[PDB]
Amino acid sequence: GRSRLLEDFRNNRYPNLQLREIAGHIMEFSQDQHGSRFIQLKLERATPAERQLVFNEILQAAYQLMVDVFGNYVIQKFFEFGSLEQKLALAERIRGHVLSLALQMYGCRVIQKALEFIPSDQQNEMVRELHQHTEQLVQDQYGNYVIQHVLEHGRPEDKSKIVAEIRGNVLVLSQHKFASNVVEKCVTHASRTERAVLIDEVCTMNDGPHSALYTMMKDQYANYVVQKMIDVAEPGQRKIVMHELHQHTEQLVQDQYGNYVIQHVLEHGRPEDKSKIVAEIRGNVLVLSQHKFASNVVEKCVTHASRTERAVLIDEVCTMNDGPHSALYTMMKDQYANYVVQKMIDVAEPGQRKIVMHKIRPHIATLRKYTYGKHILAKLEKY
RNA sequence: UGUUGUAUA
């Protein structure tokens, strides 16, 4: 199916091939893996005369290039390094097809490039086509990237229109694999008023017997939205969001997705929020350290809480008993809590580390017999 | 020895 020229260029002939030599073959080269990189490289150091010759061979069938696995890079080159007249002619071929391209695996790259480098009257013409289909775009595996592009670099008036389509479905779209990222970009990149309205929407609604925010923090996708809502909420709303988190801390530290929201607060939140999380953990360090999910939260607590809060959690482990065992001994033998013991050794202050080593000392000579306890021994060979 | 989400050769 390939021309002789393309086949030979692929098979190492013409090591000095120039743009002018492949006249009449631009469309075929563009739809070829190596023909496309050739045109892209050659365009970079090509004269305006050459670039225009290339452009005339792709303009008619430009759409076909936009939806091609290899040709879409060529279209993108002209949207970024072509003449004003070339950018505008390509925008004309796009007119009436923006939606199809934004829904397309390669077309959506071309749309984002066009939105970034064509003039304003053409950006607004292109965005006008999209505003009629925001609902579909927000949930599409490719269109969601085009919506996020507008939110990150578009003009405020256009961001506001995207917020209006999301205004009302924050809870549902936050649980959507593709749309949850758009909710994030709205929360981070829209106006102050629009961010507060979106955050307030889930603050004021209930999901049956659950608070909407609690549901979101348990969701595989919406937990990322809440983390962003925590990062950008103004102080008054932030306290409202955090109140839902604190009320459900015990549930969330044991949840497969909620435990990351708790850790996010421990690593990047305010210290008094960490102090309240620690106060819920206190008295349950033994049990939570043995939990697949909560054990990670216990680790973040001793790492990021205050000096005395960490000391309290470590001292609890040192002083509490598990039936006839010391809690430390039970923790060392557990598949998860052994990691907590190791982290506690690492972060303890020398005086407290000595107390930890004292409770560990009777067991050193027999840790090798334990599936997980032996990793305490392995670690201790650095102390 | 232990847990989270979409981008092109």
From Swiss-Prot:
Region described as Guanine-nucleotide binding in RNA target: 180-299
Residues annotated as domain PUM-HD: 1-383
Induction comment: Strongly down-regulated in keratinocytes upon UVB irradiation.
Alphabetical keyword list: Acetylation, Cytoplasm, Differentiation, Disease variant, Epilepsy, Intellectual disability, Methylation, Neurodegeneration, Phosphoprotein, Repeat, RNA-binding, Spermatogenesis, Spinocerebellar ataxia, Translation regulation
Region (Adenine-nucleotide binding in RNA target): 36-40, 108-112
GO biological process, one term: spermatogenesis
Tissue specificity annotation: Expressed in brain, heart, kidney, muscle, intestine and stomach. Not expressed in cerebellum, corpus callosum, caudate nucleus, hippocampus, medulla oblongata and putamen. Expressed in all fetal tissues tested.
Main subcellular location: cytoplasm
GO MF entries: miRNA binding; mRNA 3'-UTR binding; RNA binding
Renumbered residue ranges of the record's region Uracil-nucleotide binding in RNA target: 72-76, 144-263, 223-342
One cellular component (GO) term of this entry: nucleoplasm
Subcellular location: Cytoplasm; Cytoplasm, P-body; Cytoplasmic granule
Residue spans of the Pumilio repeats: 21-56, 57-92, 93-128, 129-279, 165-315, 204-358
Keyword Transmembrane carried by entry: no
Origin superkingdom: Eukaryota
Subunit details: Recruits the CCR4-POP2-NOT deadenylase leading to translational inhibition and mRNA degradation. In case of viral infection, interacts with DHX58. Interacts with TRIM71 (via NHL repeats) in an RNA-dependent manner.
UniProt domain comment: The pumilio repeats mediate the association with RNA by packing together to form a right-handed superhelix that approximates a half donut. RNA-binding occurs on the concave side of the surface. PUM1 is composed of 8 pumilio repeats of 36 residues; each repeat binds a single nucleotide in its RNA target. Residues at positions 12 and 16 of the pumilio repeat bind each RNA base via hydrogen bonding or van der Waals contacts with the Watson-Crick edge, while the amino acid at position 13 makes a stacking interaction.
Record disease entry: Spinocerebellar ataxia 47: A form of spinocerebellar ataxia, a clinically and genetically heterogeneous group of cerebellar disorders. Patients show progressive incoordination of gait and often poor coordination of hands, speech and eye movements, due to degeneration of the cerebellum with variable involvement of the brainstem and spinal cord. SCA47 is an autosomal dominant disease with a highly variable phenotype and incomplete penetrance. Clinical features include developmental disability, ataxia, and seizures. Neurodevelopmental disorder with motor abnormalities, seizures, and facial dysmorphism: An autosomal dominant disorder characterized by global developmental delay, impaired intellectual development, early-onset seizures, poor overall growth, delayed walking, hypotonia and/or ataxia, and facial dysmorphism. Some patients have hypoplasia of the corpus callosum and cerebral atrophy.
Physiological role: Sequence-specific RNA-binding protein that acts as a post-transcriptional repressor by binding the 3'-UTR of mRNA targets. Binds to an RNA consensus sequence, the Pumilio Response Element (PRE), 5'-UGUANAUA-3', that is related to the Nanos Response Element (NRE). Mediates post-transcriptional repression of transcripts via different mechanisms: acts via direct recruitment of the CCR4-POP2-NOT deadenylase leading to translational inhibition and mRNA degradation. Also mediates deadenylation-independent repression by promoting accessibility of miRNAs.
Protein name, as recorded: Pumilio homolog 1
Organism field: Homo sapiens (Human)
Full protein stretch here: 828 to 1167 of 1186
